[PDB]
Specification:
The structure is cut from a larger assembly and holds five copies of chain A and two copies of chain E (155 residues). With 48 residues, chain A is α+β, with helices and mostly antiparallel strands. Chain A has one helix and two strands. The longest helix of chain E is centred in the middle third of the chain and has 22 residues. The chains are: A alpha+beta (48), E mainly alpha (155). Chains B and D meet through loops of B and α1 of D. β2 of chain E pairs antiparallel with β1 of chain F, so a sheet runs across the interface. Chains E, F: Pfam families: DUF4054. Chains E, F: InterPro entries: DUF4054.
Chain lengths: 48, 49, 48, 48, 155, 155, 49
């Protein structure tokens, strides 16, 4: 994603700093909305 | 395999609201915060040229 | 041989305990779809 | 507790390193502003 | 509460057709008594409900009526017998040169032994035995819903 | 519900062929009574289904009809006896100079003992015993489908 | 042995889609990533002539 929209304001990629967790494959990126895999998703069942 | 594929497909993204709700339990908070608080507590020093 | 022996143990662990009951099966087959429903409910809600 | 290892050393290190964070985060702002206000009130020019 | 219908009762048991010897007041009273041996409350979740409950109540009422009417006119002296007439299953009999021996039912308590007295009681016992198969699970919670099994399912 | 055919019923049992003695309303009432003992819902996944289920229902109806007969005209004096005629297997009998003894059926509860009263009940009990072999297993999931066995078959 | 041949032949390629789906699991990701992460940590120096 080269641009992020926050409350109607457009921001270019270069101005922002984004950190992501584990990197999903390209086909799975849209499902995760171009983000890393959350830890809670991987820990909630075992914690319970 | 079919059962294996179903088992591996079951895991997936849950949702931001779901993650926020899960994030109230003490165990999850400790697990996600101890490393972060421990990593950057010693500090850093600056070197110029 | 080693791989099959390693794979065998979880399969038996999956079915370690078996439970059986006796009943007058004649009355059971007389009008089922309710006997079956009751036992399915018991299995669904089974716990200590 | 009964049956647990009695090494204790790593636990003491972890407790001390957790105690350091408390001084870093909770006590520092209040005491910093206290010293600033005391210096301003008692006309102590040198910063502390 | 199930409303007693004397017309259906008389249709079901023609031996009680005579209105002179069997006034409706006695039938209603015996139904009111019989609604206490077996609960007359009905719900769809009960093992016995609807027509099964109706048949059970009618059979119990007929059994009570027969047992009661035995006493008053038995010994050709208006029940002048000191202790009345006792009930129970008759395993053997003999009249002159005619003899019959029958099979004793498997009674194990007062309820079944009393029910074996008359054919209506026997039919009621048979119906209860058929409907008594299985059991109840009363306490418990669905604990298994919290774990993943087979194909990533929680059912 | 299962439709009750009076023509087929009378064809099956020629001893009930008289319509004057056995009105169709009586047969319908007894079928409606018998459908409570045995569920009449038909599915391909039941042990009893189709012709077997219809045979059981008809046999139960005939058993009830004969049981009623022994009361309505077994005494034949309008049912003026004390407690009514009692049913059950006759293990021994004697009339004049002829004596006959038979084998006692293995009855273990009220259902089988009540069934053994009449030949139709005996036939129904035998059919149920034949169809009753086997068992049930209700709760279960194919846990074994996730492992490789013998020749790489998950089946 | 026919059974041995079948058992050894059953294992084979599964598909890129299957690999991508299976990669979601935490343990598989950890196993695949730990070695790669550890290999390139201590860094290197540039020496010329």
């Amino acid at each position: 994603p080269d641009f992020w929209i926050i409350s109607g304001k457009k921001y270019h990629r270069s101005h922002l700093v984004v950190v992501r967790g584990p990197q999903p494959p390209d086909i799975l990126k849209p499902t995760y909305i171009f983000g890393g895999i959350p830890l809670t998703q991987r820990i909630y069942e075992r914690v319970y | 395999p079919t059962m294996l594929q179903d088992w591996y497909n079951s895991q997936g993204f849950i949702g931001y609201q779901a993650c926020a709700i899960i994030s109230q339990h003490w165990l999850v908070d400790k697990a996600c915060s101890m490393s972060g608080e421990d990593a950057a507590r010693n500090g850093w020093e600056l070197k110029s040229d | 041989a080693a791989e099959r022996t390693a794979n065998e143990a979880p399969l038996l662990a999956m079915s370690k305990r078996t439970s059986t009951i006796h009943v007058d099966v004649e009355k059971a087959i007389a009008n089922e779809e309710a006997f079956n429903a009751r036992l399915a409910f018991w299995i669904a809600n089974r716990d200590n | 507790p009964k049956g647990f290892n009695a090494t204790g050393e790593h636990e003491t290190i972890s407790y001390h390193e957790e105690l350091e964070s408390i001084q870093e985060h909770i006590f520092d702002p209040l005491l910093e502003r206290h010293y600033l206000l005391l210096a301003k009130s008692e006309e102590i020019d040198v910063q502390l | 509460m199930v409303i007693f219908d004397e017309h259906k009762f008389r249709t079901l048991f023609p031996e009680f057709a005579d209105p002179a010897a069997y006034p409706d007041v006695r039938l209603q009273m015996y139904f009111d008594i019989a609604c206490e041996f077996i609960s007359d409350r009905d719900s769809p979740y009960r093992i016995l409900n609807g027509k099964a409950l109706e048949a059970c109540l009618y059979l119990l009422t007929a059994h009570l009526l027969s047992l009661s009417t035995m006493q008053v006119q038995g010994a050709a002296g208006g029940g002048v017998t000191a202790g009345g007439t006792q009930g129970g299953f008759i395993t053997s009999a003999t009249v002159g040169e005619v003899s019959v021996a029958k099979l004793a039912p498997p009674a194990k308590n007062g309820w079944q032994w009393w029910l074996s007295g008359t054919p209506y009681g026997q039919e009621l016992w048979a119906l209860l035995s058929v409907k008594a198969v299985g059991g109840f699970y009363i306490g418990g919670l669905p604990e298994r819903r919290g774990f993943r099994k087979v194909g990533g399912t929680f059912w």
